[PDB]
């Protein structure tokens, strides 16, 4: 990079026409001149030559990505992880111009977080903090198609958390073994029975027949409950063949979807998304591999950010425990990007898991701040002493109990199911 | 995990039949007792329950998956990533084979990605720090995948490139550029001597070059080219675009004279890129964005190696990664493990073409050559060609004439004394 030239990969965002750009935030370190690796940085990821030689033209002004503003943090002695002049961590905001990738994901993941993103010279330590999609931009994405109240809707869930369950065991069962745990938790109230994020189509247990028994036994829990309940069928497999599990699994009486996000791809989930008759929701495999870092990779925000963009119902991501290595704040902001406001795109329902069980709904409930979310009881649910039925039964106990100011142990007194969860 | 349970997630491979099993390398720091995190960890990727309660039945035969060996490096005073995690105890820096039962996920990738780098493999309470150094497929599993249909034998055939590494071009500037004045600097490198022109890991279907008209446009140029040097070309249309559309965009960019597709790898999904390698009637060579979030840290995520050799058996017949530079932050002998994966026997997948690339030019030709140490390989020079002093036509031409210097034994000085072209980038 060249002294003069340094100057135009900056900007004020009051100087931009900021319909055109996306925002992002990145944490780095930089090694040399921080202003000229900020630069180099930008062109990377952008314009990395803006004209031909000898020829009178720019395409910066178009094309280029911009530093919109940025923050020297602090300078450090080395760099936070040793990869291969003074080095200072920084906090930068840059100004991407949409219309180099357009609205695809794959070109925008390409952009973003591609080759410029983590190979530029002075800047061997970078982690995509955040992603702020201006309306124009989005305008040209679907979002989700049932949201939070497609859900709630569906289960005629209203003014209360809603019950996710993992029948347990998973692998080993067999459909008809496997339609009777999940028959059990939903005569309990749990509101939905889904299948582990590592059963799918195989062998042992296809989703046609697994889909078969289980809407069967979906059916007659509603009949006998009287409420709503909703079967979450895993169909992640090959991409080329989506759309097919998607109709043999609804057909059969699945009436949602489950989908590995990354192992697909936000983009194939972003085609499923706009074919499913049913809601769709995803889970989090795979993302850990680069949002764990604090100071490397891509904030796990972001691509809960995706997933609702891409089309996703519900997403399922680690929770509230400290069992499932996520602090606490991240969590949050995670719950958070899937029910903030989008232009347009319909919130989708945060379902942090990980470390649940009736003891924990309350807490849960407290630090999300209101009730649009995912239960995940993870413990004491199928496990509990009496059975899967007391197991959910205890779940909703729990709930009533919040529902009334008393206490979980108070309710308990009366409660032989939500008692049994406090014995242990 | 109980102690009993323990013994039920170890095994030897001798007693297994290892063709029902796919085995991983992890390297991970536990924290207490080892061997009991080691099940966990195998648990948690396969049977957290291996029965119903008050069941005489055991699932772990068949489903879980096992450890067959490990190692202790050695014990750590600290994490090597201050990750926030419940356990407590010693902890430990360990290297540990196992044996996952592919009947669990089967010949699908996504699947694959779920089991052996999902949420148990990230998760596991005593296991904080784990990254995926590598997996062996057994012959049955890799027998109901397809492979790059055209691997290396398919492009030397195409280029009629033989005893000689392949050369690769990025056509700069890129972006910036419209179709026609994009063709005619793809159209000079040609000339020059350059095997493969290609569009930039960012350029695309978009409004300002559309992949139909700079396809017309460079199909167009491409032809010219191969008539006037008499030597095959390729044109290596970028399109790596939503799922949706990809193999449409295999139309429009073939019909119209693209003869070679890039795809951006991971963006796309690897299962993306089995998909259209299934598709193609042009080989696919994938590019490396986004690979880097997670193959950096040097004990955490999953090794790059791994990706090459995902994409080569999605189907991808080149792999362009990061190269021998320095600047391309990864260590030679990286580099190196990577490029023998896209080459190294496959049980009947196709070898892909590695194409080392990152900061080489004419002068560094000699040094890639000798540490890749045949002639396998795609070259791709980043500076010194289209930048060159005398032109497009003649930074080809010079990376040609490194190679010939090569060919003969003589230095690139020597070859330079009579070589302009060779020599400009010799001043430099």
Same mark, same amino acid.
């Given at each position: 990079?060249?002294?003069?030239?340094?100057?135009?990969?900056?900007?004020?965002?009051?100087?931009?026409?900021?319909?055109?750009?996306?925002?992002?935030?990145?944490?780095?370190?930089?090694?040399?001149?921080?202003?000229?690796?900020?630069?180099?940085?930008?062109?990377?990821?952008?314009?990395?030559?803006?004209?031909?030689?000898?020829?009178?033209?720019?395409?910066?002004?178009?094309?280029?990505?911009?530093?919109?503003?940025?923050?020297?943090?602090?300078?450090?002695? /080395?760099?936070?992880?040793?990869?291969?002049?003074?080095?200072?961590?920084?906090?930068?905001?840059?100004?991407?111009?949409?219309?180099?990738?357009?609205?695809?994901?794959?070109?925008?993941?390409?952009?973003?977080?591609?080759?410029?993103?983590?190979?530029?010279?002075?800047?061997?330590? =970078?982690?995509?903090?955040?992603?702020?999609?201006?309306?124009?931009?989005?305008?040209?994405?679907?979002?989700?198609?049932?949201?939070? #109240?497609?859900?709630?809707?569906?289960?005629?869930?209203?003014?209360?958390?809603?019950?996710?369950? =993992?029948?347990?065991?998973?692998?080993? $069962?067999?459909? !008809?073994?496997?339609?009777?745990?999940?028959?059990?938790?939903?005569? !309990?109230?749990?509101?939905?029975?889904?299948?582990?994020?590592?059963?799918?189509?195989?062998?042992?247990?296809?989703?046609?027949?697994?889909?078969?028994?289980?809407?069967?036994?979906?059916?007659?829990?509603?009949?006998?409950?009287? #409420?709503?309940?909703?079967? $979450?069928?895993?169909?992640?497999? #090959?991409?080329?063949?989506?759309?097919?599990?998607?109709?043999?699994?609804?057909?059969?009486?699945?009436?949602?979807?489950?989908?590995?996000?990354?192992? =697909?791809?936000?983009?194939?989930?972003?085609?499923?998304?706009?074919?499913? /008759?049913?809601?769709?929701?995803?889970?989090?495999?795979?993302?850990?591999?680069?949002?764990?870092?604090?100071?490397?990779?891509?904030?796990?925000?972001?691509?809960?950010?995706?997933?609702?963009?891409?089309?996703?119902?519900?997403?399922?991501?680690?929770?509230?425990?400290?069992?499932?290595?996520?602090?606490?704040?991240?969590?949050?902001?995670?719950?958070?990007?899937?029910?903030?406001?989008?232009?347009?795109?319909?919130?989708?329902?945060?379902?942090?898991?990980?470390?649940?069980?009736? $003891?924990?709904?309350?807490?849960?409930?407290?630090?999300? !701040?209101?009730?649009?979310?995912?239960?995940?009881?993870?413990?004491?649910?199928?496990?509990?002493?009496?059975?899967?039925?007391?197991?959910?039964?205890?779940?909703?106990?729990?709930?009533?109990?919040?529902?009334? !100011?008393?206490?979980?142990?108070?309710?308990?007194?009366?409660?032989?199911?939500?008692?049994?969860?406090?014995?242990?």
């Amino acid at each position: 990079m060249n002294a003069e030239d340094v100057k135009g990969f900056f900007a004020s965002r009051e100087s931009l026409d900021m319909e055109q750009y996306l925002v992002l935030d990145y944490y780095l370190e930089s090694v040399g001149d921080i202003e000229t690796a900020l630069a180099h940085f930008c062109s990377e990821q952008s314009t990395a030559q803006w004209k031909r030689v000898g020829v009178d033209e720019d395409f910066r002004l178009v094309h280029a990505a911009k530093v919109i503003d940025y923050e020297v943090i602090e300078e450090l002695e /080395q760099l936070s992880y040793p990869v291969k002049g003074k080095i200072h961590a920084c906090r930068v905001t840059i100004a991407h111009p949409h219309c180099n990738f357009g609205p695809k994901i794959p070109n925008l993941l390409t952009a973003v977080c591609g080759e410029g993103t983590y190979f530029t010279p002075g800047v061997p330590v =970078v982690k995509l903090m955040d992603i702020h999609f201006p309306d124009t931009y989005l305008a040209d994405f679907e979002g989700p198609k049932f949201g939070i #109240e497609g859900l709630r809707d569906i289960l005629n869930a209203h003014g209360r958390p809603i019950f996710f369950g =993992v029948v347990k065991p998973n692998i080993g $069962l067999s459909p !008809g073994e496997f339609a009777e745990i999940a028959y059990q938790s939903w005569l !309990g109230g749990l509101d939905i029975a889904k299948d582990d994020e590592m059963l799918a189509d195989v062998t042992w247990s296809s989703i046609e027949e697994r889909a078969a028994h289980l809407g069967k036994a979906r059916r007659k829990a509603e009949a006998e409950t009287g #409420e709503p309940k909703i079967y $979450l069928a895993n169909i992640t497999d #090959e991409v080329d063949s989506l759309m097919e599990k998607h109709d043999v699994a609804v057909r059969n009486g699945a009436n949602a979807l489950l989908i590995n996000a990354l192992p =697909v791809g936000l983009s194939a989930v972003r085609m499923l998304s706009n074919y499913t /008759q049913v809601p769709l929701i995803g889970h989090f495999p795979f993302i850990a591999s680069f949002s764990r870092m604090e100071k490397y990779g891509i904030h796990s925000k972001v691509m809960t950010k995706l997933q609702r963009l891409a089309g996703l119902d519900a997403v399922i991501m680690p929770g509230f425990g400290d069992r499932m290595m996520t602090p606490e704040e991240e969590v949050l902001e995670n719950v958070i990007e899937c029910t903030k406001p989008m232009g347009r795109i319909k919130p989708c329902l945060p379902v942090p898991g990980g470390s649940d069980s009736a $003891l924990t709904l309350q807490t849960v409930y407290e630090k999300v !701040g209101n009730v649009d979310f995912g239960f995940v009881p993870g413990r004491g649910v199928f496990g509990h002493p009496m059975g899967p039925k007391a197991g959910a039964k205890s779940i909703r106990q729990a709930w009533e109990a919040i529902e009334q !100011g008393i206490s979980i142990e108070t309710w308990a007194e009366t409660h032989p199911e939500l008692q049994a969860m406090v014995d242990q």
